[PDB]
Design a binder for this molecule. Structure first.
Ligand SMILES: [Zn+2]
Ligand SMILES: [Zn+2]
Length: 59
């Protein structure tokens, strides 16, 4: 894993779930933050905006 990609579920062959839900990436894409733990959901890119930080994992 490297810089942010939305990887098709098809290609990825890898870590399945976003760290935030401890739930699954699966709705459409695979997301990564190489910066931080590096796997996301679509819920998860949004996760931060009110409740957290600019990114979730980054702290
Ligand atoms: Zn999630
Ligand atoms: Zn991050």
């Amino acid at each position: 894993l490297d810089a942010f990609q939305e990887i098709p579920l098809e290609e990825y062959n890898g870590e399945r779930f976003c760290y935030g839900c401890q739930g699954e990436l699966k709705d459409q894409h695979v997301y990564v933050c190489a910066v931080c733990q590096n796997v996301f959901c679509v819920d998860c890119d949004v996760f931060v905006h009110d409740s957290l930080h600019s990114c979730p994992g980054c702290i």
